[PDB]
Amino acid sequence: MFLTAEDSFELGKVAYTEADYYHTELWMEQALRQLDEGEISTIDKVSVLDYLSYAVYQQGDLDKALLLTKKLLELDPEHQRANGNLKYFEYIMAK
């Protein structure tokens, strides 16, 4: 079976709150996949990129977190949290 972007986003958001980053990434990736396939949906791609970049960083993959952050800002240059995450990730990696 498979989840819509909406249901996988719901699942990933719960995982996020609790604070299960592996499952936040697994479920947010499913949302992303559904959206890129052209699923009609209320959920938006920057929102999933928001949770996904964070879930990935928490598991130690800064390279991916930064790439997803840059993908996010490509779609939304003015995103507040992602602009800060850009600076924040780059700071960690520079160490």
CB of 91 to a copy of itself, least distance (A): 6
Question: Can residue 80 be called a binding residue for a copy of itself (CB under 8 A)?
Answer: yes
| SS3 of the chain | CCCCHHHHHHHHHHHHHCCCHHHHHHHHHHHHHHHHCCCCCCCCHHHHHHHHHHHHHHCCCHHHHHHHHHHHHHHCCCCHHHHHHHHHHHHHHHC
Q: Of 1 and 38, which CB lies nearer to a copy of itself in the complex structure? A: 1
Site residues for a copy of itself, window 7-66 (CB under 8 A)?
Answer: 7, 10-11, 14-15, 20, 22-23, 26, 57-58
CB of 77 to a copy of itself, least distance (A): 14
Question: Can residue 93 be called a binding residue for a copy of itself (CB under 8 A)?
Answer: no
Q: Of 41 and 88, which CB lies nearer to a copy of itself in the complex structure? A: 88
